[PDB]
Amino acid sequence: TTHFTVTDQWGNVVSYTTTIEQLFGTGILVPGYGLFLNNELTDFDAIPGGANEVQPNKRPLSSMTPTIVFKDEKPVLTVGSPGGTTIIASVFQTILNYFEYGMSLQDAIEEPRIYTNSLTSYRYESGMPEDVRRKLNDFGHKFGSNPVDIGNVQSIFIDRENKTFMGVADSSRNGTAVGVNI
């Protein structure tokens, strides 16, 4: 899964999340074509009979969450990330950090995240204070004994007041932001 974003001088805004699922997908490479092939159908439920059971011609449920945020009919921010089912949680947290904490965009991105889907799945980014993790686990959580990076937000903020775009690439990988003038 990767997420990227683009903004032009004629107002268009692109938030694009996109994947082959697992890294290298199934691993399969179309022979003598070099093309890697997705395992996406394993996003479908294994035991059948629920909303997200396998069906011919059906699409398996995704977690992808490319987003654009608008203040006053006009798009001001763009957010998205990879990270499997943790995506929902990354974007959620990025938006909180940026709009509820009033953090800079990069700061909101970099600010350590958690993720937890059930009582048996917990992850946290390095930065979670130890005293705090400990006191959480006393309370009934299961943040394990060592951290992991969660997700990869790329994002552009649209600055009317200064008439520019500010683009940021999450540190989790070697991504990059660059703007164009003239």
Binding site: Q9, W10, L29, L61, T67, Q106, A177
Partner: protein
């Protein structure tokens, strides 16, 4: 650089060589969609484990101009031979994720190329020889691999060893290290062919047929028919308001939009910024909130052409209030079931709630 500012465009992507080329496209007057397309090909070559024309995507765009917002939904579809229980062994037991993950049954009909064509034509104003050519150069003449790619190839030696991939990502018995030059001659072949005869190399060509071969060679049920049938779809966003902003996100068949909005709706009333960002309080309310939303996702989320997702119910003001009951600072909820959002939307589930592992 990881942070930077510009007047007339901005591109931000996962790979430095993918950023780069989109920017070039904007500098030569190409629009954001043109550039996005270019980037996706570039990422396919430079970040091959992550994104690809052998996969799916969701492309959200704000228009010009018309000021409407839409999504090019190029998510893969299951071939007609797929079956609800294809992921069980003969004993009715779920097949190991490691096993399901490499099998032909896992492969959905790739839609990314069809999605690029949809986007370009709607908002395209370039090409369609220009935006894949620079990717052809990187595939043909190669580029040095970054750490993320280097690690991916190391961390997945064994999956890649079993496929045609091993020839080129596992040159002899080892995997390329950071800085090694990655050449994808065959991928360049395919990319050149994409530009020349258009997409239908893929949905009606060698390529489509060749994929049908391999999916079956690995156990899967994909035919060239399936590939010829595939078409992307356009979605209008799911919307939300939060903190006086207006949010456009992905609707079903993604779980992302609904539950990220629900996550915000749940957490909004808690005025989180009262607490320090690295405090017990924040973490606990986040954790509790995630449990609720993720439970809802596991019970109610699927492709809406086939199922009913209570979008209205899952975000109902009174539903949110009900569920927010279950989120306190004075203990952790251990009773983490799905809510009943159906009590707030008109309908009934056309499916059950089935546990997964």
């Amino acid at each position: 650089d990881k942070v930077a500012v510009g007047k007339d465009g901005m591109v931000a992507t996962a790979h430095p060589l993918a950023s780069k080329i989109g920017a070039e496209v904007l500098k030569k007057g190409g629009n954001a969609i043109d550039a996005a397309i270019a980037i996706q090909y570039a990422l396919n070559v430079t970040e091959p484990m992550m994104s690809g024309i052998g996969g799916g995507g969701f492309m959200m765009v704000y228009d010009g101009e018309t000021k409407e917002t839409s999504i090019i939904n190029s998510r893969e579809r299951a071939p007609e031979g797929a079956k609800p229980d294809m992921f069980l062994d003969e004993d009715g037991k779920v097949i190991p994720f490691s096993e399901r993950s490499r099998h032909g049954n896992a492969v959905g009909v790739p839609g990314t190329l069809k999605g690029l064509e949809a986007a370009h034509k709607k908002w395209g104003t370039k090409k369609m020889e220009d935006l894949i050519s620079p990717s052809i150069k990187l595939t043909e003449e190669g580029f040095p691999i970054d750490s993320v790619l280097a690690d991916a190839i190391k961390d997945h030696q064994d999956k890649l060893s079993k496929t045609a991939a091993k020839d080129i990502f596992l040159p002899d018995g080892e995997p390329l290290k950071e800085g090694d030059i990655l050449v994808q001659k065959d991928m360049a072949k395919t990319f050149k062919l994409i530009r020349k005869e258009g997409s239908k190399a893929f949905y009606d060509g060698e390529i489509g047929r060749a994929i049908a071969d391999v999916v079956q060679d690995f156990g899967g049920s994909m035919t060239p028919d399936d590939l010829s049938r595939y078409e992307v779809t356009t979605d209008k966003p799911i919307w939300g308001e939060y903190h006086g902003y207006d949010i456009a996100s992905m609707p079903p068949p993604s779980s992302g939009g609904v539950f990220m909005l629900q996550m915000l709706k749940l957490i909004d009333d808690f005025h989180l910024s009262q607490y320090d960002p690295k405090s017990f309080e924040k973490y606990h309310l986040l954790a509790e909130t995630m449990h609720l939303s993720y439970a809802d996702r596991a019970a109610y989320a699927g492709d809406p052409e086939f199922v009913d997702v209570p979008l209205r119910g899952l975000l109902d003001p009174d539903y949110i209030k009900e569920r927010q009951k279950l989120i306190s600072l004075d203990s952790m909820n251990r009773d983490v079931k799905e809510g009943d959002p159906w009590k707030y939307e008109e309908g009934e589930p056309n499916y059950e709630i089935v546990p997964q592992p």
